Design a protein around this nucleic acid. Structure first.
Ligand code: UDP
Length: 351
DNA sequence: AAAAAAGTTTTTT
DNA sequence: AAAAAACTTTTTT
């Protein structure tokens, strides 16, 4: 049983980029469940083999991490092209890891055939014909199916909480008490404005000391529907493997998601925050049944409630510590079911 | 020192 | 087979 895992649209080298990091983390957690897996990318490296030096059909399972396939500038992007050529050459079922609602599987050929550089490829080389099974991080498969309505060979859909790999890694550990320098923190990208209203609601004009780290920049928040006066402090992006340490610098860390994530997706940040030294504060709309933690104190409905909750946490170190203890225990409750999680993954990739 | 000019890297869906 | 920003390094006030 030989497994190959690839990222469909980003080069994989180290933990300096999120797409690379997630692909390596996946390679690691799969390896840790006793499976023989190789990451195949553009070049050989510490964690990878090169597309041009391996035969994709020597593998029994091909796993693909979702990605955008947009050709910015209308120029060729080898990460996308080489990955899809690799997929197209494969003659068995492809397992597409759908961790981001914005990144459903899509074919590059239709968007390559009319380019001035189309001559560099052929339909046979890029058009992926093998059956594809979508492994949805979201429990609502109708939403996952809707996102893949325009791709005929996607014949199977199955839910699997892919994002739990963060807590099941062999080197995992909870963050320790950390000196606080912020009231609230949130790390992420702008996501092309898909979550602008929520970001403005909970991170802007709060009167609190808030930091927004990651790709996002203040000048990206210009939608007239969600005005603001005082923005949080924006700092640069950091490596994925340093995120929990960053979250720990704050009293609390925010959990919000895209509309389609509500009561559907449990995201990496849920685990990165829950395991950190920052109290996890979740937008009620994101988890209305409180399935993450059955304690109302971890949920906020709007800006005012967030401000009040944070004020309460700043005022009572006892409450802060009590809540951290609670979220840490809940996290460990899920870590306890690691074997179950591993078995469900194997079943998802037909093993 | 501080501002402008050059050069380089990253982001954009 | 781009353009706009963001981020650095060098040259001028
Ligand atoms: O500087 C940063 C900011 C974010 N992240 C990662 O990016 C994820 C969030 O991605 P996104 O902005 O798409 O938000 P999501 O949809 O996952 O909530 C976080 O959980 C981290 O794993 C990171 O590695 N470095």
């Amino acid at each position: 049983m030989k497994i190959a895992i690839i990222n469909m649209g980003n080069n994989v080298i180290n933990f300096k980029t999120v797409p690379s990091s997630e692909t390596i983390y996946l390679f690691k957690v799969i390896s840790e469940m006793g499976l023989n897996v190789d990451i195949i990318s553009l070049k050989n490296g510490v964690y990878t083999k090169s597309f041009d030096e391996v035969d994709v059909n020597d593998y029994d399972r091909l796993i693909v991490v979702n990605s955008s396939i947009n050709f910015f500038g209308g120029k060729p992007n080898l990460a996308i092209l080489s990955a899809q050529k690799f997929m197209a050459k494969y003659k068995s079922k492809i397992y597409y890891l759908f961790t981001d609602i914005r990144l459903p599987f899509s074919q590059s050929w239709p968007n390559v055939k009319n380019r001035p550089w189309a001559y560099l490829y052929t339909e046979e080389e890029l058009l992926i014909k093998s059956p594809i099974k979508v492994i949805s991080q979201g429990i609502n498969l109708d939403i996952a199916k809707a996102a893949h309505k325009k791709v005929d060979n996607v014949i199977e859909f199955e839910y699997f909480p892919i994002e739990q790999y963060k807590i099941h890694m062999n080197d995992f550990q909870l963050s320790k008490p950390t000196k606080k320098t912020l009231d609230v923190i949130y790390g992420g990208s702008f996501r092309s404005g898909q979550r602008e209203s929520k970001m403005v609601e909970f991170l802007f004009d709060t009167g609190l000391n808030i930091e927004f780290f990651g790709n996002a920049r203040e000048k990206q928040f210009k939608n007239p529907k969600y005005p603001w006066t005082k923005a949080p402090v924006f700092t640069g992006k950091i490596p994925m493997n340093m995120v929990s340490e960053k979250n720990s610098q704050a009293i609390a860390a925010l959990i919000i998601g895209d509309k389609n994530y509500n009561d559907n997706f449990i995201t990496l940040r849920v685990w990165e925050t829950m395991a950190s030294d920052a109290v996890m504060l979740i937008d009620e709309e994101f988890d209305t049944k409180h399935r993450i933690i059955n304690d109302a104190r971890f949920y906020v409905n709007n800006r005012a409630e967030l401000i009040d909750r944070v004020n309460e946490l700043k005022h009572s170190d006892v409450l802060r510590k009590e809540m951290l203890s609670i979220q840490h225990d809940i996290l460990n409750k899920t870590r306890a079911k690691k074997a179950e999680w591993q078995d469900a993954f194997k079943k998802a990739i037909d093993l």
